[PDB]
Write a protein that binds this DNA or RNA. Structure first.
Ligand SMILES: [Mg+2]
Ligand SMILES: [Mg+2]
Ligand SMILES: [Mg+2]
Ligand SMILES: [Mg+2]
Ligand SMILES: [Mg+2]
Ligand SMILES: [Mg+2]
Ligand SMILES: [Mg+2]
Ligand SMILES: [Mg+2]
Ligand SMILES: [Mg+2]
Ligand SMILES: [Mg+2]
Ligand SMILES: [Mg+2]
Ligand SMILES: [Mg+2]
Ligand SMILES: [Mg+2]
Ligand SMILES: [Mg+2]
Ligand SMILES: [Mg+2]
Ligand SMILES: [Mg+2]
Ligand SMILES: [Mg+2]
Ligand SMILES: [Mg+2]
Ligand SMILES: [Mg+2]
Ligand SMILES: [Mg+2]
Ligand SMILES: [Mg+2]
Ligand SMILES: [Mg+2]
Ligand SMILES: [Mg+2]
Ligand SMILES: [Mg+2]
Ligand SMILES: [Mg+2]
Ligand SMILES: [Mg+2]
Ligand SMILES: [Mg+2]
Ligand SMILES: [Mg+2]
Ligand SMILES: [Mg+2]
Ligand SMILES: [Mg+2]
Ligand SMILES: [Mg+2]
Ligand SMILES: [Mg+2]
Ligand SMILES: [Mg+2]
Ligand SMILES: [Mg+2]
Ligand SMILES: [Mg+2]
Ligand SMILES: [Mg+2]
Ligand SMILES: [Mg+2]
Ligand SMILES: [Mg+2]
Ligand SMILES: [Mg+2]
Ligand SMILES: [Mg+2]
Ligand SMILES: [Mg+2]
Ligand SMILES: [Mg+2]
Ligand SMILES: [Mg+2]
Ligand SMILES: [Mg+2]
Ligand SMILES: [Mg+2]
Ligand SMILES: [Mg+2]
Ligand SMILES: [Mg+2]
Ligand SMILES: [Mg+2]
Ligand SMILES: [Mg+2]
Ligand SMILES: [Mg+2]
Ligand SMILES: [Mg+2]
Ligand SMILES: [Mg+2]
Ligand SMILES: [Mg+2]
Ligand SMILES: [Mg+2]
Ligand SMILES: [Mg+2]
Ligand SMILES: [Mg+2]
Ligand SMILES: [Mg+2]
Ligand SMILES: [Mg+2]
Ligand SMILES: [Mg+2]
Ligand SMILES: [Mg+2]
Ligand SMILES: [Mg+2]
Ligand SMILES: [Mg+2]
Ligand SMILES: [Mg+2]
Ligand SMILES: [Mg+2]
Ligand SMILES: [Mg+2]
Ligand SMILES: [Mg+2]
Ligand SMILES: [Mg+2]
Ligand SMILES: [Mg+2]
Ligand SMILES: [Mg+2]
Ligand SMILES: [Mg+2]
Ligand SMILES: [Mg+2]
Ligand SMILES: [Mg+2]
Ligand SMILES: [Mg+2]
Ligand SMILES: [Mg+2]
Ligand SMILES: [Mg+2]
Ligand SMILES: [Mg+2]
Ligand SMILES: [Mg+2]
Ligand SMILES: [Mg+2]
Ligand SMILES: [Mg+2]
Ligand SMILES: [Mg+2]
Ligand SMILES: [Mg+2]
Ligand SMILES: [Mg+2]
Ligand SMILES: [Mg+2]
Ligand SMILES: [Mg+2]
Ligand SMILES: [Mg+2]
Ligand SMILES: [Mg+2]
Ligand SMILES: [Mg+2]
Ligand SMILES: [Mg+2]
Ligand SMILES: [Mg+2]
Ligand SMILES: [Mg+2]
Ligand SMILES: [Mg+2]
Ligand SMILES: [Mg+2]
Ligand SMILES: [Mg+2]
Ligand SMILES: [Mg+2]
Ligand SMILES: [Mg+2]
Ligand SMILES: [Mg+2]
Ligand SMILES: [Mg+2]
Ligand SMILES: [Mg+2]
Ligand SMILES: [Mg+2]
Ligand SMILES: [Mg+2]
Ligand SMILES: [Mg+2]
Ligand SMILES: [Mg+2]
Ligand SMILES: [Mg+2]
Ligand SMILES: [Mg+2]
Ligand SMILES: [Mg+2]
Ligand SMILES: [Mg+2]
Ligand SMILES: [Mg+2]
Ligand SMILES: [Mg+2]
Ligand SMILES: [Mg+2]
Ligand SMILES: [Mg+2]
Ligand SMILES: [Mg+2]
Ligand SMILES: [Mg+2]
Ligand SMILES: [Mg+2]
Ligand SMILES: [Mg+2]
Ligand SMILES: [Mg+2]
Ligand SMILES: [Mg+2]
Ligand SMILES: [Mg+2]
Ligand SMILES: [Mg+2]
Ligand SMILES: [Mg+2]
Ligand SMILES: [Mg+2]
Ligand SMILES: [Mg+2]
Ligand SMILES: [Mg+2]
Ligand SMILES: [Mg+2]
Ligand SMILES: [Mg+2]
Ligand SMILES: [Mg+2]
Ligand SMILES: [Mg+2]
Ligand SMILES: [Mg+2]
Ligand SMILES: [Mg+2]
Ligand SMILES: [Mg+2]
Ligand SMILES: [Mg+2]
Ligand SMILES: [Mg+2]
Ligand SMILES: [Mg+2]
Ligand SMILES: [Mg+2]
Ligand SMILES: [Mg+2]
Ligand SMILES: [Mg+2]
Ligand SMILES: [Mg+2]
Ligand SMILES: [Mg+2]
Ligand SMILES: [Mg+2]
Ligand SMILES: [Mg+2]
Ligand SMILES: [Mg+2]
Ligand SMILES: [Mg+2]
Ligand SMILES: [Mg+2]
Ligand SMILES: [Mg+2]
Ligand SMILES: [Mg+2]
Ligand SMILES: [Mg+2]
Ligand SMILES: [Mg+2]
Ligand SMILES: [Mg+2]
Ligand SMILES: [Mg+2]
Ligand SMILES: [Mg+2]
Ligand SMILES: [Mg+2]
Ligand SMILES: [Mg+2]
Ligand SMILES: [Mg+2]
Ligand SMILES: [Mg+2]
Ligand SMILES: [Mg+2]
Ligand SMILES: [Mg+2]
Ligand SMILES: [Mg+2]
Ligand SMILES: [Mg+2]
Ligand SMILES: [Mg+2]
Ligand SMILES: [Mg+2]
Ligand SMILES: [Mg+2]
Ligand SMILES: [Mg+2]
Ligand SMILES: [Mg+2]
Ligand SMILES: [Mg+2]
Ligand SMILES: [Mg+2]
Ligand SMILES: [Mg+2]
Ligand SMILES: [Mg+2]
Ligand SMILES: [Mg+2]
Ligand SMILES: [Mg+2]
Ligand SMILES: [Mg+2]
Ligand SMILES: [Mg+2]
Ligand SMILES: [Mg+2]
Ligand SMILES: [Mg+2]
Ligand SMILES: [Mg+2]
Ligand SMILES: [Mg+2]
Ligand SMILES: [Mg+2]
Ligand SMILES: [Mg+2]
Ligand SMILES: [Mg+2]
Ligand SMILES: [Mg+2]
Ligand SMILES: [Mg+2]
Ligand SMILES: [Mg+2]
Ligand SMILES: [Mg+2]
Ligand SMILES: [Mg+2]
Ligand SMILES: [Mg+2]
Ligand SMILES: [Mg+2]
Ligand SMILES: [Mg+2]
Ligand SMILES: [Mg+2]
Ligand SMILES: [Mg+2]
Ligand SMILES: [Mg+2]
Ligand SMILES: [Mg+2]
Ligand SMILES: [Mg+2]
Ligand SMILES: [Mg+2]
Ligand SMILES: [Mg+2]
Ligand SMILES: [Mg+2]
Ligand SMILES: [Mg+2]
Ligand SMILES: [Mg+2]
Ligand SMILES: [Mg+2]
Ligand SMILES: [Mg+2]
Ligand SMILES: [Mg+2]
Ligand SMILES: [Mg+2]
Ligand SMILES: [Mg+2]
Ligand SMILES: [Mg+2]
Ligand SMILES: [Mg+2]
Ligand SMILES: [Mg+2]
Ligand SMILES: [Mg+2]
Ligand SMILES: [Mg+2]
Ligand SMILES: [Mg+2]
Ligand SMILES: [Mg+2]
Ligand SMILES: [Mg+2]
Ligand SMILES: [Mg+2]
Ligand SMILES: [Mg+2]
Ligand SMILES: [Mg+2]
Ligand SMILES: [Zn+2]
Lengths: 122, 131, 63, 204, 59, 118
RNA sequence: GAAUGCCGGCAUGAGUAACGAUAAAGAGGGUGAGAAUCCCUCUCGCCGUAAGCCCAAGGGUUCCUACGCAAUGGUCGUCAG
RNA sequence: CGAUGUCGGCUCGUCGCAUCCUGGGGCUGAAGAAGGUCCCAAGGGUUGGGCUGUUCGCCCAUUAAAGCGGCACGCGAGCUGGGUUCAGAACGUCGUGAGACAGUUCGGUCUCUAUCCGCCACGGGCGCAGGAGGCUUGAGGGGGGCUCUUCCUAGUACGAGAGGACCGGAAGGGACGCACCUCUGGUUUCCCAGCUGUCCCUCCAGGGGCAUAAGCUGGGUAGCCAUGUGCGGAAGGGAUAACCGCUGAAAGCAUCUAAGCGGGAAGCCCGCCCCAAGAUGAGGCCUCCCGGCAGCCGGUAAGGACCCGGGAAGACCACCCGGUGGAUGGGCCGGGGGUGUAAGCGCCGCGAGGCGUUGAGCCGACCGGUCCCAAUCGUCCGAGGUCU
């Protein structure tokens, strides 16, 4: 459950370290973003000389939530952080690596690059 | 009429008895059926069960692991048909039923608070002595 | 485009309850201008027409 | 336009095609028809169904005459399914097959005299910033001297629940005839043990 | 609030009219099968101390 | 809403209800029979019956359990030695409530008697 | 017949708000025409740099005892300043 | 003016249509896609945020769209009180001054009890010509009414290309609504455990009070819940709007019109869900009851009430179930469920402790069983059926 004001760890090597959601891009008034959804965010912390910098307005896909996501098989999964991967307008990851595990829902919503780059898909 | 027995009767046809018996604090490997593309495979997920949430056929557990630097935590229906098998990898002795508290502990600290349940380990090896 | 709204300071049940302040905005230029000095919106619409004349006399000067 | 009477027994979930599907279990059958409503006689077509056997010592004489004329044995509930005329003298869960899609009517749970936030999802008031004894209050209920009154149907506090509700287009997940059981996907109005009516859906 | 207040005096008619619901209902009494005294049903007889056909209470 | 909730409040907070039931149990078990209000009398039945049954079990653990509620060693001796054996073959239903005919003057409260059964 | 008139009486609101700290009560016995409210006993709770004890001011018989319950006591009252 | 409280906000709406979106349509300098403009259309919808007391406005990120107005610029006996509009103080300014400013600045008491109308809910009475127990019809009324994206058709029509369809299908969403608690996730005032201090029971051990109206902490069934689950917006039928026609005169031609006939909107009527015969126009069906003197008196019948045990019913009332020929509540028993291995004893350790007995003990509500306890015994109402 990500909404405006929520910080997320960024799980890539774009240089961003923390972003703040300012809008969940899912209809005219979606309250929450979960895994697989796209958000517009401000970059609140970044490492020197990254591809993105503090202040930039970026897009990202939520790869991990601390609120557990439910699956049709009756199981659920939950991670310790809220994490996103910064993308372009072709939903393509804007860095070269992604860190930590990502949820399998990303596959179903068309984030194939990110799913394959992930060290583990749960 | 006995509504409880009617429920239990509808459930009887999905109840599962082949899975091994485990307790909060034990370390468990769940071989879980998973669907991706274009196939289905079996994915193992192994960690400490921190919770068993009992309601007959509707009991569920929660298993916790650290996957490349991130805590991951899965909830399985005990009687799910997508569980191939469950393997007991270690018996831990906890002092309570719910182990939420290890979420906040280092691996050292967890490893000190959940020492091996030497009794039930001895039980496991007294069994698997097959005839 | 001339907007009309309430003043922002003293006045009483007036200022509250009367749309005396005007804002004239020249559309193609983006120049905005207000006036709240008097109590009538027409004193203010007058004054803001002056100030708006003079500001487009100052751009056409700056050109 | 088929239907049957029943009792809500409880909820669980089954597994179908690697999907956990939530179900409400209903004990529906068997229902004897104790009167038929004909256009001749009654102005419409319907069938009054009986359900749950009753101890005859609790059945008074006029009701006993009614049952006896049907050659039927005393029953706890009489409810009428409209535009339905089953061909036998007893209605069971056989009338529904899995995959069919049904409307379920029950008496919702009664919430007694309910506030405006619980009944009508009003926002209530602030819980700080000076808010004074109005944290769960409706706010304004009108205008001023025009119209100088309150609309009919104005949402206000009052009793809520314990009232007829129909939930429509529910999937029949399974039927178990040897127990007169009906597994419908989803939520059915009312408490466990409550009386319900299961009908063929009017949705296409 | 702003201290609401009756607009008019209630008439004798409207007063007594709301009071059309205030009459008491008499207590419901049955004879004691022992001493034949009247008492509330389902209570121990205060006159002879029996209930359910047996002495229960010093009276 | 109070759906399927068991137990009365008796306009007392938690500890005061608790002390209420304990004291009245002490009063029954001392006198074998008391007069109280009908609601309080109806609440006593279960909580005295538990203590009596536990006395019928007779072991040390039951004595300490009962003695959490009753506190009085002598009274608990009376419970195990003298009240309990009386109910060896009776399975529950160690108390009865019988409603009294007349109300309390000062507050109109309806009254009842609570007894240990024969 | 009126002066938001003056004095007095009696209405309406209304059997309604309220009965003055959320420290808390229960039972057995006694007395009595009458007892949740008075006395006695057991159990429970509260204060304890006080909600205990002593002095000064102020108050002025409120002290003790016997006999009483119309009124005073926010209920009751056999009790009491 | 013997008082009609005012700006902005919040809450709750409702109405208008000069329509922001969605639906239908004409013209286009309409190839397609996308626009422009005008007509029809008020059913539903019309986001979050930065600034400022602000309305307004600017800006950020979205969106199908981020509509404009009325309702005492709706709404302070509903809230707020930042702004204006008391007393304090200060700046600039004006005045010799006291003081003053549609100029600014910091601060500054917003009244427990609803009589009538109205509104939301719930009853009592009487009526509905005989009196009763059930089951219904639906006059009339209320609810609801939104929309996007992707894929197939088809990279086809069109187009130099870039782009890119009509019609017709499918899949998945956002917000809203109704219900529900199997799952997810809450609470769970005493259901279990652990802990400190103190006082006590009984010295040890084991326990109890209090530290909150749970002392604190870790957990937590039922119930009630959303963050969780199911389902709804329709389909379809009818009449229309703008608009498009067929046939067709007056007026040899022409004309959608004058006689006729057709097509046609998220809108209208039905359809779906809920209420509903006080619908005094009081409806219908099934079944039961059969003496004293258009009245009256008494005792009854069918039946109902009282009283009692209770209830996911409930403020009281009502409703529903049960009342010994009974499982209604309480106990007890079994199960579920929570907690997580009681006490006691034995063994190891100097000891705090540890190990075994032991998934032990304790154990609200959930699912059942069992007459052990309690619904004892009873009492009262209640037809004798108006005339053509
Ligand atoms: Mg990372
Ligand atoms: Mg910087
Ligand atoms: Mg159940
Ligand atoms: Mg069965
Ligand atoms: Mg692997
Ligand atoms: Mg681990
Ligand atoms: Mg398999
Ligand atoms: Mg201002
Ligand atoms: Mg104005
Ligand atoms: Mg004005
Ligand atoms: Mg199946
Ligand atoms: Mg029903
Ligand atoms: Mg209720
Ligand atoms: Mg409310
Ligand atoms: Mg609510
Ligand atoms: Mg609601
Ligand atoms: Mg709110
Ligand atoms: Mg606020
Ligand atoms: Mg709120
Ligand atoms: Mg205030
Ligand atoms: Mg408050
Ligand atoms: Mg209000
Ligand atoms: Mg006003
Ligand atoms: Mg007002
Ligand atoms: Mg009017
Ligand atoms: Mg109701
Ligand atoms: Mg239920
Ligand atoms: Mg107020
Ligand atoms: Mg007020
Ligand atoms: Mg008021
Ligand atoms: Mg106030
Ligand atoms: Mg007042
Ligand atoms: Mg008045
Ligand atoms: Mg009179
Ligand atoms: Mg009146
Ligand atoms: Mg006598
Ligand atoms: Mg409550
Ligand atoms: Mg109960
Ligand atoms: Mg209790
Ligand atoms: Mg209760
Ligand atoms: Mg009660
Ligand atoms: Mg209480
Ligand atoms: Mg009280
Ligand atoms: Mg009290
Ligand atoms: Mg409490
Ligand atoms: Mg306490
Ligand atoms: Mg206490
Ligand atoms: Mg019990
Ligand atoms: Mg009784
Ligand atoms: Mg009585
Ligand atoms: Mg008295
Ligand atoms: Mg005169
Ligand atoms: Mg006067
Ligand atoms: Mg006067
Ligand atoms: Mg006056
Ligand atoms: Mg006067
Ligand atoms: Mg006079
Ligand atoms: Mg006078
Ligand atoms: Mg006077
Ligand atoms: Mg009068
Ligand atoms: Mg008076
Ligand atoms: Mg009253
Ligand atoms: Mg009143
Ligand atoms: Mg009142
Ligand atoms: Mg009161
Ligand atoms: Mg008070
Ligand atoms: Mg008090
Ligand atoms: Mg006495
Ligand atoms: Mg006494
Ligand atoms: Mg007294
Ligand atoms: Mg007295
Ligand atoms: Mg007192
Ligand atoms: Mg005394
Ligand atoms: Mg103390
Ligand atoms: Mg001290
Ligand atoms: Mg002196
Ligand atoms: Mg004096
Ligand atoms: Mg004296
Ligand atoms: Mg004196
Ligand atoms: Mg003295
Ligand atoms: Mg004295
Ligand atoms: Mg004396
Ligand atoms: Mg006196
Ligand atoms: Mg007196
Ligand atoms: Mg007196
Ligand atoms: Mg005298
Ligand atoms: Mg007095
Ligand atoms: Mg008095
Ligand atoms: Mg006083
Ligand atoms: Mg005397
Ligand atoms: Mg005194
Ligand atoms: Mg005036
Ligand atoms: Mg006046
Ligand atoms: Mg006046
Ligand atoms: Mg006035
Ligand atoms: Mg006035
Ligand atoms: Mg409006
Ligand atoms: Mg128009
Ligand atoms: Mg349009
Ligand atoms: Mg259009
Ligand atoms: Mg086009
Ligand atoms: Mg073009
Ligand atoms: Mg157009
Ligand atoms: Mg036009
Ligand atoms: Mg037109
Ligand atoms: Mg509209
Ligand atoms: Mg409208
Ligand atoms: Mg509108
Ligand atoms: Mg906005
Ligand atoms: Mg800020
Ligand atoms: Mg703001
Ligand atoms: Mg603003
Ligand atoms: Mg601000
Ligand atoms: Mg402005
Ligand atoms: Mg500007
Ligand atoms: Mg867009
Ligand atoms: Mg558009
Ligand atoms: Mg307006
Ligand atoms: Mg105006
Ligand atoms: Mg306004
Ligand atoms: Mg206004
Ligand atoms: Mg206002
Ligand atoms: Mg106010
Ligand atoms: Mg205001
Ligand atoms: Mg007012
Ligand atoms: Mg008002
Ligand atoms: Mg007013
Ligand atoms: Mg404010
Ligand atoms: Mg102010
Ligand atoms: Mg200020
Ligand atoms: Mg001010
Ligand atoms: Mg001011
Ligand atoms: Mg002023
Ligand atoms: Mg001032
Ligand atoms: Mg001043
Ligand atoms: Mg200053
Ligand atoms: Mg100066
Ligand atoms: Mg000046
Ligand atoms: Mg001056
Ligand atoms: Mg000067
Ligand atoms: Mg000067
Ligand atoms: Mg000034
Ligand atoms: Mg200043
Ligand atoms: Mg201050
Ligand atoms: Mg000021
Ligand atoms: Mg206030
Ligand atoms: Mg006042
Ligand atoms: Mg009042
Ligand atoms: Mg009133
Ligand atoms: Mg009026
Ligand atoms: Mg009525
Ligand atoms: Mg009635
Ligand atoms: Mg109708
Ligand atoms: Mg009407
Ligand atoms: Mg309608
Ligand atoms: Mg294609
Ligand atoms: Mg081509
Ligand atoms: Mg299409
Ligand atoms: Mg849809
Ligand atoms: Mg449950
Ligand atoms: Mg739950
Ligand atoms: Mg659950
Ligand atoms: Mg849970
Ligand atoms: Mg729970
Ligand atoms: Mg306890
Ligand atoms: Mg001692
Ligand atoms: Mg000691
Ligand atoms: Mg000790
Ligand atoms: Mg202690
Ligand atoms: Mg103490
Ligand atoms: Mg305390
Ligand atoms: Mg405690
Ligand atoms: Mg602690
Ligand atoms: Mg918890
Ligand atoms: Mg807790
Ligand atoms: Mg939700
Ligand atoms: Mg939907
Ligand atoms: Mg033509
Ligand atoms: Mg033609
Ligand atoms: Mg014509
Ligand atoms: Mg046509
Ligand atoms: Mg036509
Ligand atoms: Mg055509
Ligand atoms: Mg048509
Ligand atoms: Mg639609
Ligand atoms: Mg109906
Ligand atoms: Mg009728
Ligand atoms: Mg009806
Ligand atoms: Mg009429
Ligand atoms: Mg009728
Ligand atoms: Mg009919
Ligand atoms: Mg009878
Ligand atoms: Mg009740
Ligand atoms: Mg009452
Ligand atoms: Mg009934
Ligand atoms: Mg009955
Ligand atoms: Mg009986
Ligand atoms: Mg009997
Ligand atoms: Mg029972
Ligand atoms: Mg039972
Ligand atoms: Mg049990
Ligand atoms: Mg169990
Ligand atoms: Mg268990
Ligand atoms: Mg042990
Ligand atoms: Mg032990
Ligand atoms: Mg030793
Ligand atoms: Mg050892
Ligand atoms: Mg058990
Ligand atoms: Mg039996
Ligand atoms: Mg019995
Ligand atoms: Mg009798
Ligand atoms: Zn008697």
């Amino acid at each position: 459950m990500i909404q405006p004001q929520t910080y997320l760890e960024v799980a890539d090597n774009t240089g961003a370290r923390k972003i703040m959601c300012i809008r969940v891009l899912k209809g005219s008034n979606a309250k929450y973003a979960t895994v697989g959804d796209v958000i517009v965010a401000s970059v609140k912390e970044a490492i020197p000389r990254g591809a993105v910098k503090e202040g930039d307005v970026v897009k990202a896909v939520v790869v991990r939530t601390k609120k557990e996501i439910k699956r049709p098989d009756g199981s659920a999964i939950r991670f310790d952080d809220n994490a996103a991967v910064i993308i372009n307008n072709q939903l393509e990851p804007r860095g070269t690596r992604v860190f930590g595990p990502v949820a399998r829902e990303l596959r179903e919503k068309g984030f194939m690059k990110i799913v394959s780059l992930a060290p583990e898909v749960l | 009429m006995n509504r409880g027995a009617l429920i239990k009767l509808v459930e009887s046809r999905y109840v599962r008895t082949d899975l091994p018996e485990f307790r909060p604090g034990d370390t468990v490997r769940v071989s879980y059926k998973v669907k991706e593309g274009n196939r289905t495979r079996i994915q193992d997920f192994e960690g400490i069960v921190i919770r068993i949430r009992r309601n007959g056929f509707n009991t569920t557990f929660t298993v916790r692991k650290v996957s490349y630097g991130v805590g991951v935590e899965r909830i399985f229906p005990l009687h799910s048909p997508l569980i191939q098998k469950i393997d007991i990898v270690q018996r831990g002795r906890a002092r309570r039923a719910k182990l939420y508290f290890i979420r906040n502990l280092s691996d050292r600290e967890i490893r000190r608070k959940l020492r091996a349940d030497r009794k039930r380990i001895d039980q496991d090896r007294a069994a698997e002595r097959a005839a | 485009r001339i907007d009309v709204y309430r003043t922002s300071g003293a006045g009483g049940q007036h200022v509250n309850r009367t749309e005396s302040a005007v804002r004239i905005t020249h559309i193609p230029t983006g120049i905005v201008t207000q006036c709240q000095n008097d109590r009538s919106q027409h004193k203010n619409k007058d004054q803001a027409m002056k100030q708006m004349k003079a500001k487009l006399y100052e751009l056409e000067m700056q050109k | 336009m088929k239907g049957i009477l029943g009792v809500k027994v409880g909820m669980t979930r089954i597994f179908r095609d690697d999907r956990a599907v939530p179900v409400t279990v209903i004990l529906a059958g068997p229902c004897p028809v104790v009167q038929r409503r004909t256009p001749e006689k009654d102005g419409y077509t319907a069938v009054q169904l009986g359900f749950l056997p009753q101890n005859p010592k609790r059945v008074n004489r006029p009701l006993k005459g009614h049952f006896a004329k049907a050659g039927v044995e005393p029953v706890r509930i009489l409810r009428e399914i409209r535009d339905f005329n089953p061909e036998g003298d007893t209605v069971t869960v056989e009338i529904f097959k899995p995959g069919e899609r049904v409307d379920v009517t029950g008496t919702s749970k009664g919430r007694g005299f309910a506030g405006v936030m619980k009944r009508w999802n009003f926002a209530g008031g602030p819980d700080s910033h000076g808010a004074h004894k109005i944290h769960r209050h409706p706010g304004s209920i009108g205008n001023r001297k025009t119209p100088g009154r309150v609309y009919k149907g104005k949402k206000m506090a009052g009793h809520y629940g314990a009232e007829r509700v129909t939930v429509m287009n529910l999937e029949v997940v399974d039927v178990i005839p040897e127990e007169n059981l009906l597994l419908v996907k989803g939520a059915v109005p009312g408490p466990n043990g409550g009386l319900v009516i299961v009908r063929e859906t009017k949705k296409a | 609030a702003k201290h609401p207040v009756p607009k008019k005096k209630t008439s004798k008619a409207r007063r007594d009219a709301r009071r059309s619901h205030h009459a008491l209902t008499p207590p419901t009494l049955v004879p004691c099968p022992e001493c034949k005294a009247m008492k509330p049903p389902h209570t121990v007889c205060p006159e002879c101390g029996y209930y359910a056909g047996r002495k229960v209470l010093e009276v | 809403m109070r759906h399927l909730k068991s137990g009365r409040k008796l306009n007392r907070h938690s500890s005061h209800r608790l002390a209420l039931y304990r004291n009245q149990a002490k009063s029954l078990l001392t006198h074998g029979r008391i007069t109280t209000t009908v609601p309080k009398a109806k609440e006593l039945r279960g909580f005295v019956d538990h203590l009596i049954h536990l006395a019928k079990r007779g072991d040390l653990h039951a004595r300490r359990l009962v003695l959490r509620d009753l506190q009085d060693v002598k009274l608990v001796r009376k419970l195990f030695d003298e009240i309990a054996p009386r109910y060896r073959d009776r399975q529950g239903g160690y108390t009865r409530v019988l409603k009294l005919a007349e109300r309390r003057r000062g507050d109109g409260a309806p009254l009842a008697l609570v007894e240990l059964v024969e």
